[PDB]
Design an enzyme around this catalytic site. Sequence first.
Site, PDB file in Angstrom:
ATOM      1  N   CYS A  81       0.700  -1.184   0.149  1.00 27.53           N
ATOM      2  CA  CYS A  81       0.001  -0.206   0.261  1.00 27.53           C
ATOM      3  C   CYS A  81       0.876   1.422  -0.178  1.00 27.53           C
TER       4      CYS A  81
ATOM      5  N   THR B  88     -14.642 -22.921   1.923  1.00 21.61           N
ATOM      6  CA  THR B  88     -15.054 -23.100   0.469  1.00 21.61           C
ATOM      7  C   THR B  88     -15.824 -24.341   0.403  1.00 21.61           C
TER       8      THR B  88
ATOM      9  N   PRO C 113     -13.387 -29.863   1.177  1.00 18.50           N
ATOM     10  CA  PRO C 113     -13.084 -29.960   2.376  1.00 18.50           C
ATOM     11  C   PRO C 113     -11.969 -29.359   2.861  1.00 18.50           C
TER      12      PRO C 113
ATOM     13  N   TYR D 245     -10.081 -23.181   3.128  1.00 19.85           N
ATOM     14  CA  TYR D 245     -10.786 -21.897   3.377  1.00 19.85           C
ATOM     15  C   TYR D 245     -10.222 -20.822   2.435  1.00 19.85           C
ATOM     16  N   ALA D 246     -10.675 -19.644   2.615  1.00 16.95           N
ATOM     17  CA  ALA D 246     -10.226 -18.655   1.928  1.00 16.95           C
ATOM     18  C   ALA D 246     -10.717 -17.253   2.417  1.00 16.95           C
TER      19      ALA D 246
ATOM     20  N   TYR E 179     -15.716  18.129  21.398  1.00 16.95           N
ATOM     21  CA  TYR E 179     -15.651  19.306  20.883  1.00 16.95           C
ATOM     22  C   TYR E 179     -14.767  20.235  21.706  1.00 16.95           C
TER      23      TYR E 179
ATOM     24  N   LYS F 144     -22.144  21.779  17.327  1.00 12.23           N
ATOM     25  CA  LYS F 144     -22.945  21.022  16.389  1.00 12.23           C
ATOM     26  C   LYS F 144     -22.050  20.606  15.233  1.00 12.23           C
TER      27      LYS F 144
HETATM   28  C1  LIG Z   1      -0.556   0.251  -4.916  1.00 15.69           C
HETATM   29  C2  LIG Z   1      -1.803  -0.333  -3.986  1.00 15.69           C
HETATM   30  C3  LIG Z   1      -2.317   0.399  -2.842  1.00 15.69           C
HETATM   31  C4  LIG Z   1      -3.251   0.246  -2.101  1.00 15.69           C
HETATM   32  N1  LIG Z   1      -3.690   1.074  -1.194  1.00 15.69           N
HETATM   33  C5  LIG Z   1      -4.589   0.877  -0.334  1.00 15.69           C
HETATM   34  C6  LIG Z   1      -5.104   1.589   0.711  1.00 15.69           C
HETATM   35  O1  LIG Z   1      -4.644   2.783   0.865  1.00 15.69           O
HETATM   36  N2  LIG Z   1      -5.943   1.033   1.459  1.00 15.69           N
HETATM   37  C7  LIG Z   1      -6.507  -0.174   1.620  1.00 15.69           C
HETATM   38  O2  LIG Z   1      -7.391  -0.509   2.294  1.00 15.69           O
HETATM   39  N3  LIG Z   1      -6.240  -1.062   0.448  1.00 15.69           N
HETATM   40  C8  LIG Z   1      -5.062  -0.647  -0.363  1.00 15.69           C
HETATM   41  N4  LIG Z   1      -4.679  -1.556  -1.202  1.00 15.69           N
HETATM   42  C9  LIG Z   1      -5.587  -2.752  -1.431  1.00 15.69           C
HETATM   43  C10 LIG Z   1      -4.775  -3.890  -0.389  1.00 15.69           C
HETATM   44  O3  LIG Z   1      -3.348  -4.100  -0.787  1.00 15.69           O
HETATM   45  C11 LIG Z   1      -5.573  -5.338  -0.499  1.00 15.69           C
HETATM   46  O4  LIG Z   1      -6.882  -5.000  -0.445  1.00 15.69           O
HETATM   47  C12 LIG Z   1      -5.016  -6.341   0.342  1.00 15.69           C
HETATM   48  O5  LIG Z   1      -3.608  -6.454   0.289  1.00 15.69           O
HETATM   49  C13 LIG Z   1      -5.665  -7.512   0.143  1.00 15.69           C
HETATM   50  O6  LIG Z   1      -4.926  -8.665   0.765  1.00 15.69           O
HETATM   51  P1  LIG Z   1      -4.796 -10.171   0.158  1.00 15.69           P
HETATM   52  O7  LIG Z   1      -4.187 -11.036   1.144  1.00 15.69           O
HETATM   53  O8  LIG Z   1      -6.167 -10.890  -0.294  1.00 15.69           O
HETATM   54  O9  LIG Z   1      -4.184  -9.915  -1.209  1.00 15.69           O
HETATM   55  P2  LIG Z   1      -2.653  -9.522  -1.407  1.00 15.69           P
HETATM   56  O10 LIG Z   1      -2.390  -8.434  -0.537  1.00 15.69           O
HETATM   57  O11 LIG Z   1      -2.696  -9.046  -3.011  1.00 15.69           O
HETATM   58  O12 LIG Z   1      -1.786 -10.745  -1.362  1.00 15.69           O
HETATM   59  C14 LIG Z   1      -1.771 -11.940  -2.072  1.00 15.69           C
HETATM   60  C15 LIG Z   1      -0.688 -12.529  -2.209  1.00 15.69           C
HETATM   61  O13 LIG Z   1      -0.694 -13.918  -2.853  1.00 15.69           O
HETATM   62  C16 LIG Z   1       0.264 -14.294  -3.628  1.00 15.69           C
HETATM   63  N5  LIG Z   1      -0.271 -15.417  -4.506  1.00 15.69           N
HETATM   64  C17 LIG Z   1      -1.074 -15.427  -5.278  1.00 15.69           C
HETATM   65  N6  LIG Z   1      -1.355 -16.573  -6.000  1.00 15.69           N
HETATM   66  C18 LIG Z   1      -0.057 -17.202  -5.608  1.00 15.69           C
HETATM   67  C19 LIG Z   1       0.062 -18.687  -5.759  1.00 15.69           C
HETATM   68  N7  LIG Z   1      -0.511 -19.530  -6.628  1.00 15.69           N
HETATM   69  N8  LIG Z   1       1.018 -18.983  -5.171  1.00 15.69           N
HETATM   70  C20 LIG Z   1       1.813 -18.397  -4.191  1.00 15.69           C
HETATM   71  N9  LIG Z   1       1.250 -17.114  -3.602  1.00 15.69           N
HETATM   72  C21 LIG Z   1       0.452 -16.542  -4.528  1.00 15.69           C
HETATM   73  C22 LIG Z   1       0.512 -12.862  -4.365  1.00 15.69           C
HETATM   74  O14 LIG Z   1       1.895 -12.890  -4.774  1.00 15.69           O
HETATM   75  C23 LIG Z   1       0.413 -11.968  -3.001  1.00 15.69           C
HETATM   76  O15 LIG Z   1       1.712 -11.602  -2.207  1.00 15.69           O
HETATM   77  C24 LIG Z   1      -3.601  -1.206  -2.093  1.00 15.69           C
HETATM   78  C25 LIG Z   1      -3.358  -2.074  -2.965  1.00 15.69           C
HETATM   79  C26 LIG Z   1      -2.272  -1.498  -3.945  1.00 15.69           C
HETATM   80  C27 LIG Z   1      -1.665  -2.614  -4.910  1.00 15.69           C
HETATM   81  C1  LIG Z   2     -14.142  29.302  29.171  1.00 12.78           C
HETATM   82  C2  LIG Z   2     -15.200  28.186  28.643  1.00 12.78           C
HETATM   83  C3  LIG Z   2     -14.592  27.029  28.003  1.00 12.78           C
HETATM   84  C4  LIG Z   2     -15.366  25.912  27.716  1.00 12.78           C
HETATM   85  N1  LIG Z   2     -14.984  25.037  26.854  1.00 12.78           N
HETATM   86  C5  LIG Z   2     -15.671  24.123  26.527  1.00 12.78           C
HETATM   87  C6  LIG Z   2     -15.190  23.095  25.571  1.00 12.78           C
HETATM   88  O1  LIG Z   2     -13.984  23.131  24.983  1.00 12.78           O
HETATM   89  N2  LIG Z   2     -16.093  22.073  25.111  1.00 12.78           N
HETATM   90  C7  LIG Z   2     -17.528  22.181  25.383  1.00 12.78           C
HETATM   91  O2  LIG Z   2     -18.280  21.086  25.107  1.00 12.78           O
HETATM   92  N3  LIG Z   2     -18.025  22.994  26.343  1.00 12.78           N
HETATM   93  C8  LIG Z   2     -16.827  23.795  26.688  1.00 12.78           C
HETATM   94  N4  LIG Z   2     -17.481  24.778  27.761  1.00 12.78           N
HETATM   95  C9  LIG Z   2     -18.780  24.607  28.391  1.00 12.78           C
HETATM   96  C10 LIG Z   2     -20.311  25.346  27.507  1.00 12.78           C
HETATM   97  O3  LIG Z   2     -19.810  26.695  27.574  1.00 12.78           O
HETATM   98  C11 LIG Z   2     -21.363  25.182  28.174  1.00 12.78           C
HETATM   99  O4  LIG Z   2     -21.562  23.595  28.176  1.00 12.78           O
HETATM  100  C12 LIG Z   2     -22.660  25.507  27.444  1.00 12.78           C
HETATM  101  O5  LIG Z   2     -22.401  26.812  27.200  1.00 12.78           O
HETATM  102  C13 LIG Z   2     -23.677  25.352  28.227  1.00 12.78           C
HETATM  103  O6  LIG Z   2     -24.769  26.088  27.667  1.00 12.78           O
HETATM  104  P1  LIG Z   2     -26.105  26.811  28.590  1.00 12.78           P
HETATM  105  O7  LIG Z   2     -27.064  27.579  27.861  1.00 12.78           O
HETATM  106  O8  LIG Z   2     -26.660  25.785  29.555  1.00 12.78           O
HETATM  107  O9  LIG Z   2     -25.355  27.864  29.593  1.00 12.78           O
HETATM  108  P2  LIG Z   2     -24.549  29.062  29.210  1.00 12.78           P
HETATM  109  O10 LIG Z   2     -23.818  28.861  28.031  1.00 12.78           O
HETATM  110  O11 LIG Z   2     -23.642  29.328  30.582  1.00 12.78           O
HETATM  111  O12 LIG Z   2     -25.649  30.373  29.031  1.00 12.78           O
HETATM  112  C14 LIG Z   2     -26.552  30.723  29.953  1.00 12.78           C
HETATM  113  C15 LIG Z   2     -26.769  32.192  29.999  1.00 12.78           C
HETATM  114  O13 LIG Z   2     -27.865  32.478  30.618  1.00 12.78           O
HETATM  115  C16 LIG Z   2     -27.579  33.908  31.334  1.00 12.78           C
HETATM  116  N5  LIG Z   2     -28.619  33.724  32.653  1.00 12.78           N
HETATM  117  C17 LIG Z   2     -28.539  32.982  33.760  1.00 12.78           C
HETATM  118  N6  LIG Z   2     -29.100  33.146  34.734  1.00 12.78           N
HETATM  119  C18 LIG Z   2     -30.031  34.242  34.141  1.00 12.78           C
HETATM  120  C19 LIG Z   2     -31.117  35.103  34.556  1.00 12.78           C
HETATM  121  N7  LIG Z   2     -31.537  34.807  35.975  1.00 12.78           N
HETATM  122  N8  LIG Z   2     -31.557  36.153  33.879  1.00 12.78           N
HETATM  123  C20 LIG Z   2     -31.064  36.029  32.524  1.00 12.78           C
HETATM  124  N9  LIG Z   2     -30.220  35.580  32.083  1.00 12.78           N
HETATM  125  C21 LIG Z   2     -29.618  34.496  32.810  1.00 12.78           C
HETATM  126  C22 LIG Z   2     -26.154  33.714  31.619  1.00 12.78           C
HETATM  127  O14 LIG Z   2     -25.599  35.138  31.629  1.00 12.78           O
HETATM  128  C23 LIG Z   2     -25.693  33.115  30.457  1.00 12.78           C
HETATM  129  O15 LIG Z   2     -25.520  33.938  29.222  1.00 12.78           O
HETATM  130  C24 LIG Z   2     -16.875  25.951  28.071  1.00 12.78           C
HETATM  131  C25 LIG Z   2     -17.098  26.991  28.925  1.00 12.78           C
HETATM  132  C26 LIG Z   2     -16.219  28.039  29.390  1.00 12.78           C
HETATM  133  C27 LIG Z   2     -16.965  29.243  29.881  1.00 12.78           C
END
Ligand SMILES: Cc1cc2nc3c(=O)[nH]c(=O)nc-3n(C[C@H](O)[C@H](O)[C@H](O)COP(=O)(O)OP(=O)(O)OC[C@H]3O[C@@H](n4cnc5c(N)ncnc54)[C@H](O)[C@@H]3O)c2cc1C
Ligand SMILES: Cc1cc2nc3c(=O)[nH]c(=O)nc-3n(C[C@H](O)[C@H](O)[C@H](O)COP(=O)(O)OP(=O)(O)OC[C@H]3O[C@@H](n4cnc5c(N)ncnc54)[C@H](O)[C@@H]3O)c2cc1C
Lengths: 539, 538
Positions: free
Chosen positions: A42, A269, A272, A275-276, A422, A430
Site C-alpha cells: 500500500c 469453501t 473439504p 478456506y479463503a 468538541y 453541532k
Molecule cells: C498500490 C496499492 C495501494 C493500495 N492502497 C490501499 C489503501 O490505501 N488502503 C486499502 O485499504 N487497501 C489498499 N490496497 C489494497 C490492499 O493491498 C488489498 O486489499 C490487500 O492487500 C488484500 O489482501 P490479500 O491477502 O487478499 O491479497 P494481497 O495483499 O494482494 O496478497 C496476495 C498474495 O498472494 C500471492 N499469491 C497469489 N497467487 C499465488 C500462488 N498461486 N502461489 C503463491 N502465492 C500466490 C501474491 O503474490 C500476493 O503476495 C492497495 C493495493 C495496492 C496494490
Molecule cells: C471558558 C469556557 C470554556 C469552555 N470550553 C468548552 C469546551 O471546550 N467544550 C465544551 O463542550 N464545552 C465547553 N464549555 C462549556 C459550555 O460553554 C457550556 O456547556 C454551554 O455553554 C452550556 O450552555 P447553557 O445555555 O446551558 O449555559 P451558558 O452557555 O452558560 O448560558 C446561560 C446564559 O444564561 C444567562 N442567565 C443566567 N441566569 C439568568 C437570569 N436569571 N436572567 C437572565 N439571563 C440569565 C447567563 O448570563 C448566560 O449567558 C466551556 C465553557 C467556558 C466558560
Amino acid sequence: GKIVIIGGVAGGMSAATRLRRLMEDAEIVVMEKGPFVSFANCGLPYYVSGEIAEREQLLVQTPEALKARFNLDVRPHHEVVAIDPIEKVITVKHETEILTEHYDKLILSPGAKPFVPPITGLAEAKNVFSLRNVPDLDQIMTALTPETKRAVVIGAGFIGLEMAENLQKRGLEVTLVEKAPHVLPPLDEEMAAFVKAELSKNNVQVITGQSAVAFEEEGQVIRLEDGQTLASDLTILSVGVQPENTLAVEAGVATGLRGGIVVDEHYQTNQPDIYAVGDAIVVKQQITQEDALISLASPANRQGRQVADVIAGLERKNQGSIGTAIVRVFDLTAASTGLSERAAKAAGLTTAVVHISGKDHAGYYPGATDLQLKLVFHPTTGEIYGAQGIGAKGVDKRIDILATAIKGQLTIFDLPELEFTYAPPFGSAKDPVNMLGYAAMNLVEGLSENVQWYELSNELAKGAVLLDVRNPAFKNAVSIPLNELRERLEELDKSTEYIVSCHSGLRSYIAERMLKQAGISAKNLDGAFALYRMVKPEE
Amino acid sequence: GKIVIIGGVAGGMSAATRLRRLMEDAEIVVMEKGPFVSFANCGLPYYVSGEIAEREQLLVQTPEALKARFNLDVRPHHEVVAIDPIEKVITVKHETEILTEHYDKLILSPGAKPFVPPITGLAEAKNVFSLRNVPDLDQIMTALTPETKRAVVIGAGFIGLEMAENLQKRGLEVTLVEKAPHVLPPLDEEMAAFVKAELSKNNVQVITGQSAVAFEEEGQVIRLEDGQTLASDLTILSVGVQPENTLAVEAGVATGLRGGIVVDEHYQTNQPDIYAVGDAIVVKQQITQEDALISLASPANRQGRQVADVIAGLERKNQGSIGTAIVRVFDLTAASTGLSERAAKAAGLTTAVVHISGKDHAGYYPGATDLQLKLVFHPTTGEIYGAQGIGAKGVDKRIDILATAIKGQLTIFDLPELEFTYAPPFGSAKDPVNMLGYAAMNLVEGLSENVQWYELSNELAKGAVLLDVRNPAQFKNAVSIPLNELRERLEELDKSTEYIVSCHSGLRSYIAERMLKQAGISAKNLDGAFALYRMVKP
Ligand SMILES: Cc1cc2nc3c(=O)[nH]c(=O)nc-3n(C[C@H](O)[C@H](O)[C@H](O)COP(=O)(O)OP(=O)(O)OC[C@H]3O[C@@H](n4cnc5c(N)ncnc54)[C@H](O)[C@@H]3O)c2cc1C
Ligand SMILES: Cc1cc2nc3c(=O)[nH]c(=O)nc-3n(C[C@H](O)[C@H](O)[C@H](O)COP(=O)(O)OP(=O)(O)OC[C@H]3O[C@@H](n4cnc5c(N)ncnc54)[C@H](O)[C@@H]3O)c2cc1C
Ligand SMILES: Nc1ncnc2c1ncn2[C@@H]1O[C@H](COP(=O)(O)OP(=O)(O)O)[C@@H](OP(=O)(O)O)[C@H]1O
Ligand SMILES: Nc1ncnc2c1ncn2[C@@H]1O[C@H](COP(=O)(O)OP(=O)(O)O)[C@@H](OP(=O)(O)O)[C@H]1O
C-alpha cells in the site's frame, strides 16, 4: 496439524501469525510466489514520489524476525500451481523445482490480479506497467530516467489517483484517463467534481468518458476511443482488479460474483478443509445483505485473523463488510463509506440524499477549512446507506464516524445524539456529522423539500423560478437577500413554485421555511450554488 | 404563541432559532443578563493568549443580524429575578427598571455558575478571576499587563488546562494547583501522567493533592495546606461549576443532583409550561441510566433544538448523554468518553480494562506519532463503558469513533468489525481502535490474562515473577529472556511459578504470554507494560 497458506501478505500473514498464537505446535507454511512477505504494498505509490525515502521502510517484518518471533515456515518464490483437494496435496514451482506438499488445512489468500484491459498493442508496449508489488516497482523505477517527461495513468479509482499524485510529485507531466464519466467512480459525480478541480489546480490533465483502445509506437502513443492520442513515456495501468481465482477454479473451488471465491459463515469453501480470505473472496455487503467485492486491507486483515480463530476451534463468524475508502489528492482528501447514491439505487434501494458544507472546527479559531459531506439514506426509516466527504482536513474523522454509525445501525435520527470531542481546535458544538442528521431529519419529517443539482434545469424549464437569497455583496432569477426576505416576502407570486439557493444550503433552508409558512411553494437547492457551480459550471 | 427564553447562549439560542424556523408567527423573547447573546465563550481562553486575535471573532452573530434573520426579540442586560408559574409572568431587572413579561411557554437555560471554594481572603483579593463570559474577560484584561509575570490556575480540569496553556503562551510563569491527586481528574491516573509530563516539558509547574488555604496580601500570595507559598500576579479559579438554579428554586421548580433542574422525557419541569435545557438540568448518564451533570456544549445545543421541537408539537425525546471531552496541552491531546475506570467502579459496575499503544497512521509513512488508548468494558458481555486517549494526533478521531460505538451499543466484539478510512497517511489496516477490540476479546475469551500497574506489586509480593522480554538493547528481581530467544530458552523457567510478562509495549509481552500458556506455565500480561508503568510509578 499442518496448515498451508497460499498468499503471504494481508490475509495470509494475519492468519499465520494469529494461528501461531493459538497453536504453538502446529506446522504453518506460507507460500508466497513473490520475493517478500508482509511487504507494505500500500506504500508503493509514496515511494515513487520519494515521500517514503528508503525501500527497506516498506518491508514491515523481515523473514528472519518472522521465524524468530512466530516460528513460521515462510517460502518466497514459491508459486502454487495445482491443488488436489482429495489427496490434500498442492504442487509448487520454486525456481526449477516442482514440489509436492501435503496439508491438513489450506487457506487461500491469493488476493487479486490486475484487470487485463482490452487494448491493442499491449504485447509490443515497452513502457506499460502495473504497480502492485516490489517486482512491479523494480520495473517502474528502472524506466523513470531523467529523459522521462510525460506519464499517463489509466484508471481514476482511489489507487489510480495516488499513482497520478505521486507521479506529479516526481516532476512529470501527468494525464489521467478514466473510462467512467468522472474520477473516483466510487464517488457520486458532484462529489468527484471537487477532486477533478484539485487535479486541474495541480496541472494533472483529466480525460473522462473515454477508454484506451490501442498502444501505438511501442507504447509511446495511447489511442482513445474518439481517436485522440496521448504522448506517454510511462504508463501505469490501475484499471481495477479481479479475484486471483485461477488456482481455485482448477481445483474445483466454487466461485460466484465477479469470479470471487465463495465462502460460508466460517470462511470455508465448497472443498473439504479449504478456506479463503482476502480480496479473492465474495463478501456480504452488510447494507444490502447481498454479495459484493470489497478489496481493502482492513477486511483482509480481519478475515485472516478470524479464519485462524475458526481453524483453532473458536466460534467466529464471517459477518461481512460495508467498505470504507480514502485518498489524498494534493491539498484535498476524499473518503466514502457504504453505498453512493448511484450504487444504492443500482441495488434497488429507495434513497434520499442531503449535502452539508461545514468546517473542520470552529470558524472563530484560526485554520478552519471547508468540509463537504453527503449522506445517502432511506427517506422514511432514516436507514443510512453511505456517506461521502471532501475536504482538506477532518474528512477521515467524519467518514470513520459515519462508518461506525452504519455498523451500529444508527439512523439519521441518531446522528444528532452523537457526542464528539468538541473544543474550538477540534470541532464544533453541532458537528457537521450532527448537521447531516438535522438536515436529513427535516426532509424525512417534511419540514424541508430539496432539489438536486441534476434536477434544477428540468424544474426551471417546467416553470419553477430560482430565488437567490444571497447578500448583494443565474439569469431569470429573483434576487431578494435573506435579511430583507421577511419584509419583501409579498413581492413573490404565491401561485409560483420557487427553488431557493444561496452559497450554502443553510441560509436557503431558512428562507424556505419562511416561504413554506407564508403559503408559497418553495424547495431548497441541495448544495446550493457552491455545489452547482462545481458540477454544472456551464448551466 | 409566546415563548420566553431565559439564557441566551448554547441552549437558549439554539432553542430560539429552531423555534422560529418551526413557528414563523410565534413571539420569541430571549432574556440575557449579560451584554451579548450567542457569544463564543468556549474560545475565551484562546483570546487570552492571542490565538484568537480580535474579540469580535467571538461574537457569533451580531444583535442586528439576529432580528434580521430570525425576527427574534433579544434583550441583553435583562436579569430575570422571579417566575410566577400560575400567573405565567416573570419579573426582570433592566438597569433601573423592574419589568413584567407574560408567557405561554418558558424555557430555562440559565447554565452554570462557578463553584466558589472556601479560601480565606477571596473578597479582598484583587488578582483572582473566573473566565466564563465577556464581563469576566474584561476584568482579566486589566491583570494582563507588561508587569504581570506569574499566574496561578487553581483546578486542573479540562478548562483549567486550557487556561494554563494559554497563559503560558502569553509569556507568564504558570503554576497549576489541583486538589485531586493528579491533573485531569476525569482521567485515570496512568493516563493523566502523560499530561503532567507535557506540562513539565513546557515549564508549567504542577502541584497536586493540595488545596489553597488563603489568599494573602490582596491575592499576591497564595498559601497551600503544606505551608508552601506561591507568588501570583494573576489567579484563575477553574474549580468546576454548579447549576444556576436560584431562580428555579424560588419558583417552585424541582431540583435534583447537585442542584440541577429536574426534567422529564420532554424537557419539562414539574411546573406547567416551564421547560429546561443546558448545563442547568440533570441529564441521564446513558451508560449507567443514572442521574448526572454533563456540562458540555454539544448536549446543550442538542437539548435546545429538541425542546423547540417539543414545544412546536413534534415527537422528540430527551434521551441523555454519555459525555465526551477533549483538551489540547501544547503538543499533546487528551480526550475521554463515557466512564473512566475509577468512575465505572464507583458506580458499582463490573469492569475490565486494556491499554493499547499505537500510531496515528502507518509507521512506514513519515510523521507517525504515538497513541495511547484505554478501554473500560464489561469482562463478560463486552459492553463498553468508556475510553480515554492520549497523543499528539489522531486522538480526537479515535475517541469520537468510540463515543459513536457506545451510542450504537457496540461491544468489544464489534470493534474489530469496524472499517475505517485506511490509507498510509491516515491510519493502519488494523487501527488502534480495532486493536482495542482484539486485545479485549482475548481477555473475555480467556486467551490472555492481564495485570494492572496498580496490581503488580501485590502479585509479585505473593510469589509471581516478572519476565522481561525486551531486546537487551530495568526492574529488580526480574528474569530477562528476550522474545526472540524465548522459544528456545523456554526450558529455563520454572513451570511451578507464575510469571508476569512485560516489555516496552503489551504486544510483545502478550505474544510471550501465549507461548508460556501453551507450555503449561501460568503467565499473565502486564497491561501497559514497562512504558506505562514507568510513567505512573517511576
Ligand atoms: C498500490 C496499492 C495501494 C493500495 N492502497 C490501499 C489503501 O490505501 N488502503 C486499502 O485499504 N487497501 C489498499 N490496497 C489494497 C490492499 O493491498 C488489498 O486489499 C490487500 O492487500 C488484500 O489482501 P490479500 O491477502 O487478499 O491479497 P494481497 O495483499 O494482494 O496478497 C496476495 C498474495 O498472494 C500471492 N499469491 C497469489 N497467487 C499465488 C500462488 N498461486 N502461489 C503463491 N502465492 C500466490 C501474491 O503474490 C500476493 O503476495 C492497495 C493495493 C495496492 C496494490
Ligand atoms: C471558558 C469556557 C470554556 C469552555 N470550553 C468548552 C469546551 O471546550 N467544550 C465544551 O463542550 N464545552 C465547553 N464549555 C462549556 C459550555 O460553554 C457550556 O456547556 C454551554 O455553554 C452550556 O450552555 P447553557 O445555555 O446551558 O449555559 P451558558 O452557555 O452558560 O448560558 C446561560 C446564559 O444564561 C444567562 N442567565 C443566567 N441566569 C439568568 C437570569 N436569571 N436572567 C437572565 N439571563 C440569565 C447567563 O448570563 C448566560 O449567558 C466551556 C465553557 C467556558 C466558560
Ligand atoms: N446545507 C444545509 N442544508 C439544509 N439545512 C442545513 C444545512 N446546513 C445547516 N442546515 C440547517 O440549518 C440549521 C443550522 O443550525 P445552526 O445551529 O448552525 O444555526 P442557527 O444558530 O441559525 O440555529 C439547522 O436547522 P434545524 O435546526 O432546523 O435542523 C440545520 O439543520
Ligand atoms: N497492547 C497490547 N496488549 C495486548 N495485546 C496486544 C496489544 N497490542 C496488540 N496486541 C495483540 O497483538 C496482535 C497485534 O497484531 P498485528 O496485526 O499488529 O501483528 P501480527 O502481524 O503479529 O499479527 C493482536 O493479537 P491477536 O490477533 O491474537 O488478538 C493484538 O490483539
